[PDB]
Amino acid sequence: ATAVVRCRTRLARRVVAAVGPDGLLPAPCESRVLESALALALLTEERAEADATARLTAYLRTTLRTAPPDPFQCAVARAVLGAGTALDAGLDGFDHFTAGRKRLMFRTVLAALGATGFPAVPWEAYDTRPQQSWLHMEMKALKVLAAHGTGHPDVVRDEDWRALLPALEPGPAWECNNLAQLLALLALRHSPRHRPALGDVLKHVAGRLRPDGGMPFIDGMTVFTTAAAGLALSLLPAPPACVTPMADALALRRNPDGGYGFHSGVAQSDVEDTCYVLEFLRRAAPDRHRTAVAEAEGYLLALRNPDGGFPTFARGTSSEIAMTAAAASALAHDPDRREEVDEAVRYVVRHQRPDGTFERSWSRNATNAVFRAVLALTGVAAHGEERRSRARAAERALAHLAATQNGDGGWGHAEAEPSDPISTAYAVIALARGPRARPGGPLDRALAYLVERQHPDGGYRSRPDQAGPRPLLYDVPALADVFVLLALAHAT
Ligand SMILES: CC(C)=CCC/C(C)=C/CC/C(C)=C(\F)COP(=O)(O)OP(=O)(O)O
Ligand SMILES: [Mg+2]
Ligand SMILES: [Mg+2]
């Protein structure tokens, strides 16, 4: 068969072999400068864990020497190893509804580490609506830090301290979020009422160091990765048998609200994880997991905003394009919810930008939202005026992909970035919904790119695309193989 099919096959054997007997594809997260710096600062002011703080220091210097991250994280590392131009630079026109909260978050962090002055804002600026559980704790921690850092500790209300109590529980980070626990602990250490519980958690934070001496942003993304892998495998001509244990492992980890978190032990459900599990289960076990499917469908239908879109975590927060398209695709299978599906799709078409693109949210490349939108625009059957409206929106999106394709056949994070396999995989999934591949065509060139970039061990090593907190990148290496396999499975 073709070189693409041969590439697909080798990659699928690799992905299958990585699924564990428990039905999960391990997806650990790499060390990140930001959390290693916060961990270095915490352990250093508490004068604890000399061994671990020595490693964290060597990791920070080496990473800055050999693999510098964005200017914000560099300023954070430089601030702890020892800058307002770094905020302007890290958020270079960060186009997103969170930009205001982020400018506050990131400046308060830098100030907490002694790199700049705290923001001259009313204390209410740190007040955030109920959303993901970790955001509320993070804003409360930064409010505390700002109150002690500026010399006004009497400003801290007892409802602020209360929000940090999960950080003092033993074991792994609450919600698997290291940044959130490290921020809470940096605030908690200023409270004598809470220092008794602090020694125990410093020993478990210190034991989280990865072999390279760094601290990961999160524990991992095994649910997100397993679901994505299972969905890719179930789109092969003949799916491997292991999709059944994978589906079982996902379904038994669902949260009380019927949604799914990104990792084992994450109580916060989100729309992105839920849609991948739902799409996957509907193909590999619609009957064996009928109930899980129906509960996940009910979860999404409860998050839905009145404007037709879907948020990531909690209704009432801004709808997002990628999430709205993802939900429309996952909800389309049942004809009971065609009203909600069409309204979601219409939301997608209204927010398409004049150049045919959509948004940069949880992925730092434009192709991610393009591929979500194109699937919804072309997967949800329509007729008459609507079919023509959606086909036009899909054409403009695929055309934007063709306009920005690089000579080597791939796409980068942005139009003038060098190609990377993940950004290209997203593009391929979308292009696979356009016209059939012709020689020299955009999709044809994209497949060849993926073929050439395959590693002798059958896998892919790609620049990461995941953001969190946005726009900060974090690296889950296992996602590369999965998303490329997802692309090759749609395209072949
Ligand atoms: C799983 C995917 C790909 C989509 C849904 C969102 C999730 C679970 C992302 C990955 C896991 C975490 C903790 C974040 F990136 C979230 O980080 P934050 O809540 O600090 O991000 P801001 O809201 O501050 O931008
Ligand atoms: Mg955040
Ligand atoms: Mg976070």
UniProtKB/Swiss-Prot annotation:
Q: Which GO terms describe its molecular function?
A: isomerase activity; metal ion binding
Changing residue 132 to A has the effect of: Reduced activity to 60%
Query: Mind telling me which Pfam families this protein's record contains?
Result: SQHop_cyclase_C (PF13243)
Q: Which CDD domains match?
A: ISOPREN_C2_like (cd00688)
Q: Which reaction is recorded as catalysed by this protein?
A: (2E,6E)-farnesyl diphosphate = (5S,9S,10S)-drim-7-en-11-yl diphosphate
Reported EC number(s) for this entry are 5.4.99.-
Question: Which amino acids does the record list as binding Mg(2+) 1?
Answer: 138
**SUPFAM superfamilies named in the record:** Terpenoid cyclases/Protein prenyltransferases
Residues binding Mg(2+) 2: 138
**Manner of cofactor binding, per the entry note:** Requires a divalent metal cation for activity. The highest activity is observed in the presence of Mg(2+), but the enzyme can also use Ni(2+) and Co(2+) in vitro, while is inactive with Mn(2+) and Zn(2+). Binds a binuclear Mg(2+) cluster coordinated with Glu-138 and the diphosphate moiety of FPP.
Q: Family assignment?
A: Belongs to the terpene cyclase/mutase family.
For this entry, the protein name equals Drimenyl diphosphate synthase
Q: What organism, scientifically named, is this protein from?
A: Streptomyces showdoensis
